[PDB]
Amino acid sequence: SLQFVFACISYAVGLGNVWRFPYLCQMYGGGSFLVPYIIMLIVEGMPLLYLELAVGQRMRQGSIGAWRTISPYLSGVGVASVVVSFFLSMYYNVINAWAFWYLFHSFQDPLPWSVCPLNGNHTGYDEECEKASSTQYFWYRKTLNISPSLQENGGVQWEPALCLLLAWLVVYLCILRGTESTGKVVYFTASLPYCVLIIYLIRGLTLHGATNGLMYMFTPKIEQLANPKAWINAATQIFFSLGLGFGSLIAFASYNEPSNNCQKHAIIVSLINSFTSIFASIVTFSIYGFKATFNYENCLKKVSLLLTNTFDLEDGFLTASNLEQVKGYLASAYPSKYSEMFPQIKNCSLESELDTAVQGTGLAFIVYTEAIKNMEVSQLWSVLYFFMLLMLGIGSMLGNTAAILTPLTDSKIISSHLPKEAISGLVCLVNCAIGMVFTMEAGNYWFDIFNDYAATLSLLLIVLVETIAVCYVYGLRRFESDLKAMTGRAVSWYWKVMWAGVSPLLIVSLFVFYLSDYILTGTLKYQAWDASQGQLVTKDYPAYALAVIGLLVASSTMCIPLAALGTFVQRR
Amino acid sequence: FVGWSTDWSPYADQSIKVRISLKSALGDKAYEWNDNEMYLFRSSVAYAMRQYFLKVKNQMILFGEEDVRVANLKPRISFNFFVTAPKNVSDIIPRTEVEKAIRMSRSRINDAFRLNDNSLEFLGIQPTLGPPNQPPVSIWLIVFGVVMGVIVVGIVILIFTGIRDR
Ligand SMILES: *[C@@H]1O[C@H](CO)[C@@H](O[C@@H]2O[C@H](CO)[C@@H](O[C@@H]3O[C@H](CO)[C@@H](O)[C@H](O)[C@@H]3O)[C@H](O)[C@H]2NC(C)=O)[C@H](O)[C@H]1NC(C)=O
Ligand SMILES: *[C@@H]1O[C@H](CO)[C@@H](O)[C@H](O)[C@H]1NC(C)=O
Ligand SMILES: *[C@@H]1O[C@H](CO)[C@@H](O)[C@H](O)[C@H]1NC(C)=O
Ligand SMILES: *[C@H]1O[C@H](CO)[C@@H](O)[C@H](O)[C@H]1NC(C)=O
Ligand SMILES: O=C(O)[C@@H]1CCCCN1
């Protein structure tokens, strides 16, 4: 039991828990995103994960083998579940590359994200490095060198290309080296992320204004709770973090005994995944709240300094506790002078800073580099954190690439011509060569596209097709009888209810709501960095970016009906 | 132009404006800016002028605390000073020389009042923080090269052993 449970945990717990969940929570309102998540975990996560594990046991075959033995007209859903993994493995590694970068720039006393470069007079700081933060400047310019718009792209940045090449070499080495020696690793790789997150929580809960971050995280704003995109993203993140639809959970459960409790194991795996995501996001949002409080305090200090240098007030007379009253007093004293700079006086509040302090796919890196820069020995904590992140990414990618490669190895047509060491080498080479598009100047936008559409909605349609197949085509009574004969205990009525009607209906409703929202809006937008404004602006997707967005989902989803049509043609 | 303005003054062109922020740079334990502190500041400025005229122009000029004329004192501790000749009131040291003198010996003036270039602003004399040194070439590149080399060696040896075993 321990072996299977820890294998599933090591697969599920990855960068989707530590990296994707925090910025997804920040983007969709914090609490306004956390309430659907839990709501989407009881209905979609547990029942469908249990269904996958039971199909893995009762078939005791691979994903393609299982979905072909249930019915030939359905074999395509085994092929599509591979293709999605492909796209995932196409871009996921980029994240690991970034971590490598952040690791290699961690053996310097003047940490690159700690101090802004000099302006050029050697008297001040850079304009964009001052308008943004040092961490944000490092992430958006020194790391990605992000172009202001998707239409503007340069050449392949050689440093990110080398980092991605190194990450793929490490993945290939891990593939070749070990396949069953995870004995002590499971004892080690499952506790190190928790230890590092505990350390960063210990630092993260003693910073000034950490409760602001926690309050933002846990406040369920009803106004933005009605957004269908929040529900869609919650469901898709649940599916992407549990691994549902990738087809490797079925393979993992295929090697388990049929006299095993998959009701306990599914519940435990889902709860552990949820708890890890919540803990990592709690630490991240505590640091994020510290950042927002610091920005608010800095703005208040700047406004106070502006007023003091002009009205010739005392050094400490104008504080944050008597600002408006003194502003009114100054306005009442003489309006002629106040009229000149009234545009210049800026309004800042904690709420707006909390929404727009840091946002995007680099939220984890920026937040954690800021936290590191506020440590005592910053280098050691940076190495430890970006090594935990490297281990998580490498484990998740080992799982994903095993899911990719097992169908290829199992095919005797290819296995009779080239060694598995060459099949794996070719797969890694193809993935690394195609993933160079994420290292361009405008590569972060393509990474945004793949992170939001490559393995987002196809996982919903795949799981919907799988559950309809299990319930209605195979026959839920026959499946329940088979499972009861296998394990002695019949499936609970709650699991049957969630399998048959509730989860597919909720998935269909989510799809309908998303489609209706997209049609009504009629303008898909993406975030783009603005160095002159030093923040993020919304820009409409160009014509050619929608073709790729459509194709990424369309190929994987439509691989099922095409296979059904081919089978019908073959029969006739 | 008929009329006059109550802001022009014959000394207003050569005045250097000082702004001091005690409470920010010291927080608590900050002294009060009474006339003794003004005396010390004028003595410091006169000393700076003496140093500049001795170490640059090689002239011995006996400036004094009464040769640093101070106007428009305000509670913010923001005023205008200008330095005249040692005993020739009609002669005003031009502002450029005063600025060079202050740049030369700004460290001593800062140390006299325990201020650092941000609480003691001369409004026209912008300090230089200092160039940021760069390492020999790149530490990240060296670490990346080492890691890539060891990974490549591991991959090669594993492939060779796997091929040789079969
Ligand atoms: C105090 O400093 C002032 C300068 O601010 C000295 O005034 C300067 O005196 C010299 C000597 O007379 C002047 O040069 C002369 O100018 C006249 C004007 O045409 C010319 O006829 C002479 O041949 C000679 O070039 C200089 O112009 C004058 N500067 C100013 C601004 O008035 C003054 O002498 C100093 N007092 C003492 C006691 O040294
Ligand atoms: C500092 O550089 C800016 C350009 O960003 C320039 O406008 C300014 O005059 C410079 N300051 C000095 C003292 O030269
Ligand atoms: C700040 O608030 C005032 C009053 O609400 C408003 O007139 C002004 O446009 C706001 N923004 C700035 C930059 O002053
Ligand atoms: C900044 O530069 C000036 C000369 O340009 C130099 O005198 C000063 O000491 C520098 N500041 C430092 C090194 O802190
Ligand atoms: O938690 C993760 O990062 C991985 C992503 C791939 C599916 C399994 N979970």
Classify residue B58 as left (phi > 0), alpha (psi -120 to 50) or beta. Answer: left
Helix, strand, or coil (residue A509): helix
A 10 A CB-CB count for B94 gives 12
The answer for residues whose C-beta is within 8 angstroms of residue B147's C-beta and 6 or more apart is A166
| Distance separating alpha carbons of residues A243 and A248, to the nearest angstrom | 8
Residue A249 and residue A8 in contact, taking contact as beta carbons nearer than 8 Å: yes
| B37 burial level (CB within 10 Å; 0-12, 13-18, 19+) | middle
Helix, strand, or coil (residue B7): coil
Please name every residue paired with B92 in a beta bridge, in sequence order, or none if there are none: B84
Handedness of CA A546, A552, A554, A555 (dihedral sign): positive
- Measured between CB atoms, which of B78, B128, B152 is closest to A169? B152
Residue A348 and residue A296 in contact, taking contact as beta carbons nearer than 8 Å: yes
| Distance separating alpha carbons of residues A206 and A110, to the nearest angstrom | 24
**At residue A161, what is the residue type?**
A
| Distance separating alpha carbons of residues A153 and A442, to the nearest angstrom | 5
For A560, the token pair is 């099922």
Give buried/exposed letters for B50-88 (b at 16+ CB in 10 A, else e): bebbeeeeeeeeebeeebbeeeeeeebbbbbbbbbebee
Residue ID of nearest Cα to ligand 3 atom 4: A347
Q: Is A344 in the pocket of ligand 3 (CB under 6 A)?
A: no
| A170 burial level (CB within 10 Å; 0-12, 13-18, 19+) | buried
Tell me the residue length of chain B. 166
Tokens 């995109």 found at:
A229
Tokens 């995007």 found at:
A360
Tokens 């101070």 found at:
B70
| Strands, sheet with B120-121, edge to edge from the N-terminal-most edge strand | B68-71, B78-83, B16-20, B120-121
| Distance separating alpha carbons of residues A277 and A90, to the nearest angstrom | 23
Phi and psi at B63, nearest 5°, equal -70, 165
| Distance separating alpha carbons of residues B103 and B51, to the nearest angstrom | 11
Residue A207 and residue A286 in contact, taking contact as beta carbons nearer than 8 Å: yes
Helix, strand, or coil (residue A102): helix
Residue A400 and residue A218 in contact, taking contact as beta carbons nearer than 8 Å: no
| Distance separating alpha carbons of residues B32 and A31, to the nearest angstrom | 50
For A150, the token pair is 């998707």
| Distance separating alpha carbons of residues A443 and A466, to the nearest angstrom | 34
Residue A425 and residue A172 in contact, taking contact as beta carbons nearer than 8 Å: yes
Q: Characterize the bridge pairing of strands B16-20 and B78-83.
A: antiparallel
CB contact under 8 A, A177 and B77: no
Nearest to A81, CA basis, from A559, A413, A565: A559
Residue A288 and residue A31 in contact, taking contact as beta carbons nearer than 8 Å: no
H helix count then E strand count, chain A: 29, 2
Q: Is A89 in the pocket of ligand 5 (CB under 6 A)?
A: no
CA distances from A377 to A109, A110, A268, A374, A383 (A): 10, 12, 37, 9, 11
For A473, the token pair is 């085509």
Q: What is the 3-state secondary structure (H, E, C) of A342-396?
A: CCCCCCCCHHHHHHHCCCCCCHHHHHHHHHHHCCCCHHHHHHHHHHHHHHHHHHH
Resolution (A): 3.2
For A191, the token pair is 């506790």
| Distance separating alpha carbons of residues B114 and B122, to the nearest angstrom | 16
- DSSP line for A296-358: HHHHHHHHHHHHHHHHT--TTTS-GGGHHHHHHHHHHH-HHHHHHHTTTSPP--HHHHHHHSS
CA distances from B99 to A341, B21, B24, B37 (A): 29, 20, 25, 21
- Smallest-distance ligand from the CA of B129: 4
Classify residue B2 as left (phi > 0), alpha (psi -120 to 50) or beta. Answer: beta
**At residue B101, what is the residue type?**
A
Residue A49 and residue A270 in contact, taking contact as beta carbons nearer than 8 Å: yes
Give buried/exposed letters for B103-122 (b at 16+ CB in 10 A, else e): eebbeebbeebebebebbbb
| Distance separating alpha carbons of residues A411 and A413, to the nearest angstrom | 5
| Distance separating alpha carbons of residues A348 and A353, to the nearest angstrom | 8
Q: After which residues is chain B broken (C to N over 2.5 A)?
A: none
The answer for residues whose C-beta is within 8 angstroms of residue A466's C-beta and 6 or more apart is A48, A51, A52, A55, A67, A77, A245
Q: Characterize the bridge pairing of strands B78-83 and A535-540.
A: unpaired
Please name every residue paired with B70 in a beta bridge, in sequence order, or none if there are none: B81
Chain B nearest-CA residue for A109: B135
| Distance separating alpha carbons of residues A145 and A439, to the nearest angstrom | 10
| Distance separating alpha carbons of residues B117 and A169, to the nearest angstrom | 51
A 10 A CB-CB count for A430 gives 13
| Pocket perturbation via mutation, ligand 4, pick of B103, B118, B128, B133 by most ligand atoms within 8 A of CB | B128
- The nearest CA of chain A is from the CA of B94 a distance in Å of 25
CB contact under 8 A, B78 and A107: no
Nearest to A140, CA basis, from A358, A292, A298: A358
Residue A488 and residue A259 in contact, taking contact as beta carbons nearer than 8 Å: yes
On whether any CB of chain B is under 8 Å from the CB of A108, the answer is yes
Phi and psi at A441, nearest 5°, equal -65, -40
The answer for residues whose C-beta is within 8 angstroms of residue B112's C-beta and 6 or more apart is B40, B41, B44
- The nearest CA of chain B is from the CA of A314 a distance in Å of 5
Q: What is the dihedral of CA A378, A380, A382, A386, to 10 degrees?
A: 180
Please name every residue paired with B82 in a beta bridge, in sequence order, or none if there are none: B69
Tell me the residue length of chain A. 572
| Distance separating alpha carbons of residues A256 and A264, to the nearest angstrom | 14
Nearest to A116, CA basis, from A92, A95, A141: A141
For A443, the token pair is 């590569």
Give buried/exposed letters for A505-527 (b at 16+ CB in 10 A, else e): ebbeebbeebeeeeeeeeeeebb
| Pocket perturbation via mutation, ligand 5, pick of A400, A450, A456, A462 by most ligand atoms within 8 A of CB | A400
| A195 burial level (CB within 10 Å; 0-12, 13-18, 19+) | exposed
**At residue A558, what is the residue type?**
M
| Distance separating alpha carbons of residues A317 and A315, to the nearest angstrom | 6
Classify residue A29 as left (phi > 0), alpha (psi -120 to 50) or beta. Answer: left
Chain A nearest-CA residue for B154: A173
Task: Enumerate the residues of chain B whose CB falls inside 8 A of the CB of residue A423.
Answer: none
Handedness of CA A249, A48, A35, A454 (dihedral sign): positive
For B159, the token pair is 């492939």
